[PDB]
Design a protein around this ligand. Structure first.
Ligand SMILES: O=C(CCCCCCC(=O)Nc1ccccc1)NO
Ligand SMILES: [K+]
Ligand SMILES: [K+]
Ligand SMILES: [Zn+2]
Length: 356
């Protein structure tokens, strides 16, 4: 009944190597360590994913090219540079999410955590949006060995298109994504009209949101969706992506959330008493991202954290106030109340078909 914390010094060091988020994995772990939360969790060393394990979703052609490129020097472009050691990076995170999933299967825990995972843009044969490997999909595929129905919830700023498309043709996995949706904003997909294909029709849920949304309206909207989804789909396990690029102070500067708002969503999911795999994701204000996931780690543990940031390796990065709480920015909420309701109505309508 003690939460599992996927961690090892080698794993964090590996994750720090991603140029898009340098040293972020260390900052997140160090802050969690500084709050001594790791002593209240079961620490499990992540296995490195094998070629066969990564192949459960990704094509052999892609996996081999990724390795070849990684050894010496398919979506490898601006967002996903073909840099050396990138296959080792991909295998590590994939294996970490799988390890967490296997922990859920064994009954070792009710909640397993991998903050360095949640890379949800990767397709079976294509890297996309800083994602070389879709560890979230790999996590769901592993869970499907034991659980008959999986619910995937994506609270990242960006649409979880890679996870959605991976399961868009099946009805055993339902994907739910709350994300910014606006013409020109990555990845451009995930309108409310997108519900899946074939036998997977109505088993993909998308909630388009505009800039400036804050804790209260986000939670109410998220709860009402999850409420209908839970009763309609009746999941046996949950995969939860909690990308922190929605948090105020993120350079993306889109949503205006605090970890408290996201935390309430997490609480509502945690009370389902189901096997839950926790993943990170986006988050480009490194200190704030550590703040968020440290806070959420405390929420999972049912602990109240000291407002003042404890001294640690990255203490200087937490100026100028050096506290745990994050203050929302002073900019408008661009979401019209009537639009939110209609999106909700479409979703309720689609979930009527989920009566099987
Ligand atoms: O958080 C993410 C990462 C998505 C990939 C990034 C979107 C494209 C983008 O914003 N690119 C960019 C921005 C600033 C400077 C250079 C590239 N996914 O959830
Ligand atoms: K999302
Ligand atoms: K689906
Ligand atoms: Zn994102």
């Amino acid at each position: 009944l003690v939460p599992v914390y996927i961690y090892s010094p080698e794993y964090v060091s590996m994750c720090d190597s991603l140029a898009k988020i340098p040293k972020r994995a260390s900052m997140v772990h160090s802050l969690i360590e500084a709050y001594a939360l790791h002593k209240q969790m079961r620490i499990v060393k992540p296995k490195v994913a094998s070629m066969e394990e990564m192949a459960t979703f990704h094509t052999d052609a892609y996996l081999q090219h990724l390795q070849k490129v990684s050894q010496e020097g398919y979506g490898l472009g601006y967002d996903c540079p073909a840099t050396e050691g990138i296959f080792d990076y991909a295998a590590a995170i994939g294996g970490a999410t799988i390890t967490a999933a296997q922990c859920l299967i064994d009954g070792m825990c009710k909640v397993a955590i991998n903050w360095s995972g949640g890379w949800h843009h990767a397709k079976k044969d294509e890297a996309s949006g800083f994602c070389y490997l879709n560890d979230a999909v790999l996590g769901i595929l592993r869970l499907r060995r034991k659980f008959e129905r999986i619910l995937y919830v994506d609270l990242d700023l960006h649409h979880g298109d890679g996870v959605e498309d991976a399961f868009s043709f099946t009805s055993k996995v339902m994907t739910v994504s709350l994300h910014k949706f606006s013409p020109g904003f990555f990845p451009g997909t995930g309108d409310v009209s997108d519900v899946g294909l074939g036998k997977g029709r109505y088993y993909s849920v998308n909630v388009p949101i505009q800039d400036g949304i804050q804790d209260e309206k986000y939670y109410q909207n998220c709860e009402s969706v999850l409420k209908e989804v839970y009763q309609a789909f009746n999941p046996k396990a949950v995969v939860l992506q909690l990308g922190a690029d929605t948090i105020a102070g993120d350079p993306m500067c889109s949503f205006n959330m605090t970890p408290v708002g996201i935390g309430k969503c997490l609480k509502y999911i945690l009370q389902w008493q189901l096997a839950t795999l926790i993943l990170g994701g986006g988050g480009y204000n490194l200190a704030n991202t550590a703040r968020c996931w440290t806070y959420l780690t405390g929420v999972i543990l049912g602990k109240t954290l000291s407002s003042e940031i404890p001294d640690h390796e990255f203490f200087t990065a937490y100026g100028p106030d050096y506290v745990l709480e994050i203050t929302p920015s002073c900019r408008p909420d661009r979401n019209e109340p009537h639009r939110i309701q209609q999106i909700l109505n479409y979703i309720k309508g689609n979930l009527k078909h989920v009566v099987i």
